[PDB]
Every structure is written in structure tokens, then in C-alpha cells.
RNA sequence: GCGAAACAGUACCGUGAGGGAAAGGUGAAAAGAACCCAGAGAUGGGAGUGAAAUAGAUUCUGAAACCAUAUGCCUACAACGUGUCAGAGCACAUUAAUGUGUGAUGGCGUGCGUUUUGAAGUAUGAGCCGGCGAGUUAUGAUAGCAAGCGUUAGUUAACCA
RNA sequence: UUCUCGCAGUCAGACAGUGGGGGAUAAGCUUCAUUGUCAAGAGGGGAAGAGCCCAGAUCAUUAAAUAAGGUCCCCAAAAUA
RNA sequence: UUGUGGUAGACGAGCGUUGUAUUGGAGUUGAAGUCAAAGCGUGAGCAUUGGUGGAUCCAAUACAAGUGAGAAUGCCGGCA
């Protein structure tokens, strides 16, 4: 392979990155996958492990 | 053949100047001067000076007859404003906007002057379409 | 690497504005109102394609019904006679015949009237 | 794609007609009057070109209302004030103003529209045998 | 003089030297196609379809219709889908009516 | 980007500690418009310099909202989320395309986000336009996919060059 | 629709039929079991209606046959006895 | 052949912006920007011509992100 044409093995480098803020067309807009108005949808997070 | 005169940052507001400009559009030279010299408005002794200067540079600079001039278009475009703070009651404040107008008067000798402007617009459109056709011919040639 | 937005927002906004050309005042000037009107206009266009398919059928039925009542026959029996005689013609073309070709439309009604079914 | 149908381009084949409401029922006369005015019975019906013929009605006071409707059915008109609701019985309408009754009955059978105004205009209703409309040479047809 | 043909699913009344638009037929421009299904010809109308009655047509172009933008939108439901359609047609002109 | 590309911790606010802005680009060279006309003058219109003066000190490019002018079409018996599908007439001619601009008239038609069982909403948020504005980084764990090395395997951290 | 692993959202429901409890055989009431729809679903009927009836929208067609419902006019379509 | 309504949500495939690395190319005979037009796409989007503009920009394959604005009684500027 040259430096002007360099390629990875298929299904090794690029995978679908889940962008959480860019529009509803990606299915990950607005809410961004947290749900709706509850504790898990705030900036704090997912409480404590084992709770 | 349009002669014109301009005045930037005239203190009169465009709203109160358009009322006077609409009294002179389409009027003959002498009649426009006569109408504007006896109208009790502030924006009458400023449009008069602009009109007189426009007549002077039409019959001196551009070489026009002088007995065929009519006011083609007299308008008062919006000029730059000035912001001041008016002190209101109970500690509040508002913004006073001093308005200015850019006055421009234009007179012509030909009573068919609109046709030439439309003609120039048509010529520009035709040149665009002509460019497109020559480009299409070049694309097919290759 | 500070990517700065320019010519990206304006191009996609001017597309919506171009679509909403010919609207009343701000409905063609501002991008927001223009976008709403285009979406609403698309919904209207979608619904009226379906409604056009039904409304033009109704108009053909009305014209055909009228053309028959002048001769003493009704729409409800004309279609039945058409089916029994195996004749398969759109009400559109039949109405076009009754408006453009009175003699040939009258020929079709004469055959369906009395001739033996099949 | 397909071939478009023919639609009249503001073509006026309108003609004048005469009918005699000697003993015609109000509703039975009004339905056919509306059909004639709209031109729905015409072979070519373009529903934006008012392709319907004019009509003159004679002997309006001679129309009849079946049953006890001459004394039990009321016609109502309300002004924009309070209490301005005027009521007239079937008999009173048949005597005082019968032309208005037939006019209102025909108007009620028309679609809410901007062309229905012109359609109701083309109805000339008279209460007597005489009419100032003999200069139009209107053809005579019965029960329409 | 006139005929009722069935191209695709629509029925067209055609005269001599009449150009009408039908659905795509997969035929090159310039060929001579022979439409088969004919309902009415002159004065003899066949009940299902006339037999041996053929409509000879010449294909003029294979263009596409005007673009249609289908924008499906569910109000206040986070659903705005957009799609476009350019339906292909073919234009053909009647040359001769086979007896 | 430092609050500060300019004379910024300045102007300004507060008794004080303290708080704290905005603002860059003429032209290669000022050659920065002598002179004439109108005007009281600024200024404007010519002239002149310049490749360009619609580069003129208001000084690179100049978007939209906004305000005016005009060719063409429509509009003063008309119930309107302002559009859509049909549709005459009028006026033109194009990224040549069953063309474009307006739309007498007919059918249908209660916005966008938010949050709710349920919003045309007599619930809420936005006056309009433009810019900015919200899933990242460091260190670890698990899982999917892929590559290197392999059955006494695999792989280095700090550090040195 | 069973088993194993990765990532979730959901824990305010509503109405209609049917069997009941609380209420007074009142509630567009409240609490259950079950069949459906809406939520997250447009179209046609109901004049207008989230939940009732007929059904499930990939796009275009000015093609044809039908479901609930309907055929004097508005508004497509009927006649006999 | 069976299919293609859809919110929360799961999965897959792509567009666009800025820069870097390799290749090639355009540009004072006029690049970017910017306006207009009766073009091309299934969608993000992409061209052609003409006006203005006066010096950089484009195509392909990869890589890294301050990478996508209509709403936050959002901030700033302008204008109703
Ligand atoms: Mg989703
Ligand atoms: Mg999630
Ligand atoms: Mg909740
Ligand atoms: Mg929220
Ligand atoms: Mg939750
Ligand atoms: Mg004070
Ligand atoms: Mg103000
Ligand atoms: Mg932005
Ligand atoms: Mg001080
Ligand atoms: Mg100058
Ligand atoms: Mg300025
Ligand atoms: Mg400038
Ligand atoms: Mg009028
Ligand atoms: Mg009236
Ligand atoms: Mg009304
Ligand atoms: Mg209306
Ligand atoms: Mg309309
Ligand atoms: Mg409405
Ligand atoms: Mg949003
Ligand atoms: Mg609430
Ligand atoms: Mg509530
Ligand atoms: Mg309201
Ligand atoms: Mg409130
Ligand atoms: Mg609230
Ligand atoms: Mg508000
Ligand atoms: Mg904004
Ligand atoms: Mg791993
Ligand atoms: Mg429950
Ligand atoms: Mg409960
Ligand atoms: Mg119950
Ligand atoms: Mg009970
Ligand atoms: Mg109960
Ligand atoms: Mg309840
Ligand atoms: Mg919900
Ligand atoms: Mg429904
Ligand atoms: Mg309904
Ligand atoms: Mg389906
Ligand atoms: Mg049938
Ligand atoms: Mg039935
Ligand atoms: Mg009917
Ligand atoms: Mg789907
Ligand atoms: Mg790049
Ligand atoms: Mg350019
Ligand atoms: Mg950002």
C-alpha cells in the first residue's frame, strides 16, 4: 500500500460512533439516550454501584 | 440620462422626509421648485437645496436642456442612527434613537427612462443565458 | 482545532427559504416561518394527491350520471349493464367520450341498453 | 401519466328559463331550481365556472306546504341586536312575502361558497303572473 | 379516427398524430411499438378487448416527471423524514391504426 | 486567543474593598481629489491622479433581518395557521425543460418545540436576523470486532540512546 | 415466545364492551380481572370528537373491485313492490 | 417469496466542516468569499453559468477533532 492509498482490514478500524447530541436523524438526539426527566437523565450520573 | 445629487446623514427622519418627497416625484422642474418653496415643513428647505444642486449639475456637468428635466425619483434612504440614554422614572432608562436619512434626488430628460433600466436588466440576464449555452456547447464538444 | 460555522448554516437555511418562495410576508423572509410553511405545505401536498385521486373520480361520475339522465338511463344501472356486457371502460374515458364524441358515446349506451348480455 | 379531461374555460352557454309554481311543493321546486341554477344537470360540469342557466319563477304565492306546516312550522330571522328574532308562520310567509320564502329555500340548498352568491342572483322570483323579464325570451318548461 | 388503448393501467383515447404520455415501457427512443390492448376502435367496440386491433406508436423520449418532495412529519413527536421522487415516463405518438 | 492586537485594568460603576467593556484592514505608491458648478458651509456633481474612485479618509470582502423605488400579475360583497390540489385570463422566454411570473374561481385544510393519558390551546418557550452555545480528557474494568505472537506462551513499566 | 451474553427505555396511563368491589345500579369518579384502541397510528363513518365501527400509510398514477356507512340538495351514488 | 406506520430505545450504513500526511491539478487570461437563475441526487447534500470580489484553492486515500443550531423568560450586535 502507498501513502496515497492506505487501507485498514475491513471491520477493524472504523465502527459506528454513537454521537449523542447531533440531531434526531441519528436516533440519538435531544434526550441523548438517558430516558426522560429522572435521576439517570441528570448530569450527576447513575448513583453508586451496588445501590 | 439621469443626473443626481446626494446628502448623507440628513437630520430629518426618513418617515418625515418621504411625505415631502412624494409631493415632487414626476413633477416638472419649475413646478417642483414652486411646490417645495411654499410647504410649511422642515424637510422642505433641505430637499430644496438638494434639488437646486441637482439641477445645476444636470445643466452644467452632464449637459442637459433644462426645460425637459423632471424629478425621476426622490427618496430618503435610512441613514446611520445615534443612540442616547434618556433617564426615565424610578431609576430605569430607555434608548433614544436619533434617526438620520440619506437623501438622493435624480432627474432625467427622457420621459421613457424606466425602459432603459429594464433593458439593462434584460441584457444582464441574456448574457448569463448566453454563457450557459456556450458552456453547454463546450461540454458536448469534448 | 476551532472549526467555525459559516456557509454551512446559510446554505441549508436558504434551501428552505427557496422552497417557501411566494408566501405572504414573513412566511418567505424568515427561515423559521419558511421551514414551518414548507413542512405544512408538504403535508398538504401529500394529502391532496390522495384526495385528487378520489375527487376526479367523483367528477367523472357526476358528468357520466348527467350524460345518462338526458337519455332516460341512470348511473346505477348503466354500470351494471356495462359489467353484464363485459365492456371495460374507465368512467374517465367514458366522460371524455360524452364531452368530445357524442355520437360514439351514444353508440356505447345503445349497445349496453338492450343487446343480449354476452 | 395520462390525458387530462376537458374543462370549460369560462364559456357561457347560459340561457333563460320560465317555470310556473302553480301547485308545486316548496322543497320539490327548490331542489330542481338549485340543480338548474348550478348547472349540475348539464353534460359538461366544470365546478368553478358557474355554467348554469337563469330561471324565472311565476306564481310564488300559489305554492303549497303539505300537512300542518302552514301553522306549525316557523321561519326565523335574527338581527344583530337582542330580541331581534322575528318569526313568521308558514301561512304568513305564503301570504305576506312568498317570493322571499322561495328565494331563501333555494339559497339554503347551495354550498357555502363565493360562487353561490352569483348562483342565487340568477333566480328571479315573482309573486304574480306578470314579469318585466319578457325581453329575455325565456323558454318555458314545467315542474323545474 | 379514435381508439381507446390500455397502456400500463390507464386508458387513453387517441386520435391520429396524437402524442400521449404513459408509464415506462423499457424501449429505446425511435423504435416502433405496437400497443395490443384496444377497447374501442372507430365504431366497433369489443367487450373485453378488441382482437387484432393494434395501435402503432413511436417513442419520442424517456424523460422523468417533476421532482416530488415527500416530507413526513409527526408533530411534537421527534419525527421528520424527507424523501424525493422523480417518476419516469415515456412519450409516444400514434402513427397508424392497424385494421 | 490573556480581561486587554488601539494609549486596558483605560473609559465607566461604587464611600470603599471591589467590578469592569467595546473598538484592527484605503491604495504598489497619498499620487488624500488642484480647478469649475450649486450651496452659507459641510457636502454633492464634474475635472484630475490611479489598473480600479461603486478602492475617497463613512476607506478589504459586504450576508440576513429592516427601510424605500420600479417592469409584470392580482386585489375595494369579503369570514382568511394564509398553504395545497385543480383552474381561466394576463405578461414573458429558460441550467429547453410535458417552461417561468401572478392567481378570477372550485375541493381540502385549527403552527413549531416542550411536557403530558390527553395541547389548535383559554398550559408553556421563542419579536425578527446573524454569530456563539450543551457527551470531552486523563487513569482503570467489562464486552463486541480486527491484527501481531503462540502452546514451558504473550508483553513490557520506569530509565538510557 | 426456550437458553447465554452486550445495550437499553419503562415504574404518572386514558377510554369503550364485559364480571365485580367502594360510591347512591351517580359521576368523563376510584380500585381490580379480561377483550380492543389511543399512547407510539394517518385514512373512511360518526356534522365537528385520541380511546366507538371499518382497517393498518414504501413512493408515483386524473386506473378498477370493495369494508363500515350511505344514495332529494348541500355531497359521490336507487330503483321498483 | 415474505415484507417496508411509529415515540422511548437498540442496531447498521452514509453526508458535511476545519486541519495534517501522501499523491496529482487549477488560479491577475481571475481562487476563496458573496448574490441571482427556469439544474442533479433517496436523504443529509452537489454542481453549471453570469454579476461583485481581489489571492489562494480543489480531487482521491487515510488520520485528529473546540465537527453539524430553532427553541435553554439562553449571551452579544443589529433592526422591526
Ligand atoms: Mg428514535
Ligand atoms: Mg441509553
Ligand atoms: Mg417521569
Ligand atoms: Mg427535559
Ligand atoms: Mg428514567
Ligand atoms: Mg434619581
Ligand atoms: Mg423602538
Ligand atoms: Mg452556528
Ligand atoms: Mg471613581
Ligand atoms: Mg466620487
Ligand atoms: Mg455602513
Ligand atoms: Mg466596504
Ligand atoms: Mg370584487
Ligand atoms: Mg351579499
Ligand atoms: Mg363559515
Ligand atoms: Mg376558501
Ligand atoms: Mg383555495
Ligand atoms: Mg381554516
Ligand atoms: Mg429539537
Ligand atoms: Mg402538565
Ligand atoms: Mg394534567
Ligand atoms: Mg387560540
Ligand atoms: Mg398559566
Ligand atoms: Mg412549565
Ligand atoms: Mg412568550
Ligand atoms: Mg437567535
Ligand atoms: Mg477490546
Ligand atoms: Mg390500571
Ligand atoms: Mg392507577
Ligand atoms: Mg370499565
Ligand atoms: Mg360497581
Ligand atoms: Mg364499577
Ligand atoms: Mg378515570
Ligand atoms: Mg408519554
Ligand atoms: Mg385514526
Ligand atoms: Mg370524521
Ligand atoms: Mg405498511
Ligand atoms: Mg362498485
Ligand atoms: Mg354495503
Ligand atoms: Mg349527488
Ligand atoms: Mg420503520
Ligand atoms: Mg479536507
Ligand atoms: Mg464567484
Ligand atoms: Mg460546538
UniProtKB/Swiss-Prot annotation, chain A:
**Biased composition annotated in UniProt, kind: Gly residues:** 22-36
Please list the residue ranges that the record marks as compositionally biased, kind Basic residues. Answer: 10-21
Which parts of the sequence are annotated with region: Disordered? 1-51
What family is reported? Belongs to the universal ribosomal protein uL15 family.
Question: What interactions and quaternary structure are annotated?
Answer: Part of the 50S ribosomal subunit.
Please explain the role this protein plays, according to its UniProt record.
Answer: Binds to the 23S rRNA.
Q: What is this protein called?
A: Large ribosomal subunit protein uL15
The shown range, given as first to last of full length, is 1 to 51 of 151
Swiss-Prot record, chain B:
Annotated consequence of substituting residue 112 to R:
After 37 telithromycin passages; confers resistance to various antibiotics in combination with R114T, a 23S rRNA mutation and protein L4 H70L; requires 2 nucleotide substitutions
Leader peptide range in chain numbering: none
Pfam family example for this protein?
A: Ribosomal_L22
Sorted keywords for this record are: Antibiotic resistance, Ribonucleoprotein, Ribosomal protein, RNA-binding, rRNA-binding
Q: Where is coiled-coil annotated?
A: none
An example Gene Ontology CC term for this record:
cytosolic large ribosomal subunit
- Keyword RNA-binding in record: yes
Q: This protein's superkingdom?
A: Bacteria
Give one GO molecular function term: rRNA binding
CDD domains tied to this protein? Ribosomal_L22
This protein's record includes keyword Cell inner membrane = no
Q: Which InterPro entries match?
A: Ribosomal_uL22, Ribosomal_uL22_bac/chlpt-type, Ribosomal_uL22_bac/org-type, Ribosomal_uL22_CS, Ribosomal_uL22_sf
Question: Which GO biological-process labels does this protein carry?
Answer: response to antibiotic; translation
Quaternary structure annotation from Swiss-Prot or TrEMBL: Part of the 50S ribosomal subunit.
Q: Which NCBIfam families would you find in this protein's record?
A: rplV_bact
The Swiss-Prot or TrEMBL record describes its family as follows: Belongs to the universal ribosomal protein uL22 family.
Q: What is this protein identified as?
A: Large ribosomal subunit protein uL22
What is the gene called?
rplV
UniProtKB/Swiss-Prot annotation, chain D:
GO biological processes: negative regulation of translation; translation
Which Gene3D superfamilies has this protein been placed in? Ribosomal protein L13
Q: What would be an example GO MF term here?
A: mRNA binding
Q: Which Pfam families match?
A: Ribosomal_L13
Q: What's the name of its gene? A: rplM
Query: Which Gene Ontology cellular component annotation is one that this UniProt entry carries?
Result: cytosolic large ribosomal subunit
Query: Which domain of life does this protein belong to?
Result: Bacteria
Q: Which NCBIfam families match?
A: rplM_bact
Key words of the record: Ribonucleoprotein, Ribosomal protein
Query: In which family does this protein belong, per the annotation?
Result: Belongs to the universal ribosomal protein uL13 family.
What does the protein in this record do?
This protein is one of the early assembly proteins of the 50S ribosomal subunit, although it is not seen to bind rRNA by itself. It is important during the early stages of 50S assembly.
Which SUPFAM superfamilies does its entry note? Ribosomal protein L13
Name of this chain's protein: Large ribosomal subunit protein uL13
Kindly state the subunit structure of this protein.
Answer: Part of the 50S ribosomal subunit.
UniProtKB/Swiss-Prot annotation, chain E:
Q: Does the keyword Ribosomal protein apply?
A: yes
Q: Name one GO molecular function term.
A: rRNA binding
What do the Gene Ontology cellular component annotations say? cytoplasm; ribonucleoprotein complex; ribosome
Q: Which HAMAP family match?
A: Ribosomal_bL21
Q: Which family does it belong to?
A: Belongs to the bacterial ribosomal protein bL21 family.
> How does the annotation summarize its subunit structure?
Part of the 50S ribosomal subunit. Contacts protein L20.
The protein's name in its UniProt record: Large ribosomal subunit protein bL21
Gene (name only): rplU
Amino acid at each position: 500500500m502507498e501513502l496515497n492509498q492506505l487501507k485498514s482490514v475491513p471491520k477493524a478500524r472504523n465502527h459506528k460512533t454513537k454521537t449523542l447530541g447531533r440531531g434526531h436523524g441519528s436516533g440519538l438526539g435531544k434526550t441523548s439516550g438517558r430516558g426522560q426527566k429522572g435521576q439517570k437523565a441528570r448530569k450527576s450520573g447513575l448513583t453508586r454501584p451496588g445501590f | 440620462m439621469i443626473a443626481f445629487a446626494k446628502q448623507f446623514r440628513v437630520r430629518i427622519s426618513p418617515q418625515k422626509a418621504r411625505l415631502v418627497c412624494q409631493l415632487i416625484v414626476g413633477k416638472k422642474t419649475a413646478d417642483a421648485q414652486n411646490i417645495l418653496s411654499n410647504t410649511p415643513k422642515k424637510a422642505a428647505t433641505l430637499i430644496a437645496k438638494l434639488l437646486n444642486s441637482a439641477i445645476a449639475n444636470a445643466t452644467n456637468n452632464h449637459g442637459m436642456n433644462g426645460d425637459a428635466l423632471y424629478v425621476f425619483e426622490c427618496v430618503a434612504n435610512q441613514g446611520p442612527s445615534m443612540k442616547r440614554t434618556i433617564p426615565r422614572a424610578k431609576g430605569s432608562s430607555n434608548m433614544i434613537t436619533k434617526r438620520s436619512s440619506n437623501l438622493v434626488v435624480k432627474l432625467s430628460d427622457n420621459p421613457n427612462e424606466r425602459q432603459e433600466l429594464i433593458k439593462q436588466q434584460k441584457a444582464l440576464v441574456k448574457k448569463r443565458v448566453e454563457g450557459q449555452q456556450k458552456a453547454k456547447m463546450a461540454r458536448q464538444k469534448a | 482545532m476551532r472549526i467555525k460555522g459559516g456557509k454551512q448554516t446559510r446554505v441549508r437555511r436558504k434551501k428552505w427559504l427557496k422552497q417557501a418562495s411566494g408566501s405572504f410576508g414573513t412566511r418567505h423572509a424568515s427561515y423559521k416561518v419558511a421551514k414551518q410553511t414548507v413542512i405544512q405545505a408538504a403535508k398538504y401536498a401529500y394529502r391532496d394527491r390522495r384526495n385528487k385521486k378520489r375527487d376526479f373520480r367523483s367528477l367523472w361520475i357526476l358528468r357520466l350520471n348527467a350524460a345518462l339522465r338526458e337519455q332516460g338511463m341512470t348511473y346505477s344501472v348503466f354500470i351494471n349493464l356495462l359489467k353484464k356486457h363485459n365492456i371495460e371502460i374507465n368512467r374517465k374515458v367514458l366522460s371524455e367520450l360524452a364531452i368530445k364524441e357524442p355520437s360514439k358515446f351514444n353508440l356505447i349506451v345503445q349497445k349496453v341498453k338492450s343487446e343480449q348480455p354476452k | 401519466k395520462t390525458s387530462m379531461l376537458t374543462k370549460e374555460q369560462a364559456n357561457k352557454r347560459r340561457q333563460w328559463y320560465i317555470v310556473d309554481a302553480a301547485g308545486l311543493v316548496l322543497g320539490k321546486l327548490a331542489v330542481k331550481a338549485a340543480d338548474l341554477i348550478r348547472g349540475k344537470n348539464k353534460v359538461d360540469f366544470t365546478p368553478n365556472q358557474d355554467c348554469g342557466d337563469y330561471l324565472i319563477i311565476i306564481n310564488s304565492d300559489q305554492v303549497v306546504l303539505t300537512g300542518n306546516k302552514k301553522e306549525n312550522e316557523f321561519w326565523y330571522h335574527h338581527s344583530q341586536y337582542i330580541g331581534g328574532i322575528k318569526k313568521v308562520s308558514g301561512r304568513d310567509m305564503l301570504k305576506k312575502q312568498s317570493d322571499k320564502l322561495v328565494y331563501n329555500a333555494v339559497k339554503g340548498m347551495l354550498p357555502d361558497n363565493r360562487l353561490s352568491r352569483r348562483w342565487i342572483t340568477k333566480v328571479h322570483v315573482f309573486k304574480g303572473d306578470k314579469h318585466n323579464m319578457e325581453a329575455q325570451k325565456p323558454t318555458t318548461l314545467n315542474w323545474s | 379516427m379514435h381508439a381507446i388503448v390500455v397502456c400500463g393501467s390507464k386508458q387513453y383515447l387517441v386520435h391520429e398524430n396524437d402524442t400521449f404520455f404513459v408509464e415506462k415501457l423499457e424501449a429505446p427512443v425511435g423504435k416502433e411499438i405496437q400497443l395490443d390492448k384496444v377497447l374501442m376502435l372507430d365504431e366497433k367496440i369489443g367487450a373485453p378487448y378488441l382482437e387484432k386491433a393494434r395501435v402503432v406508436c413511436v417513442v419520442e423520449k424517456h424523460g422523468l416527471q417533476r421532482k416530488v418532495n415527500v416530507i413526513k412529519h409527526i408533530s411534537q413527536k421527534h419525527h421528520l423524514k424527507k424523501y424525493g421522487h422523480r417518476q419516469p415516463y415515456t412519450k409516444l405518438k400514434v402513427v397508424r391504426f392497424v385494421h
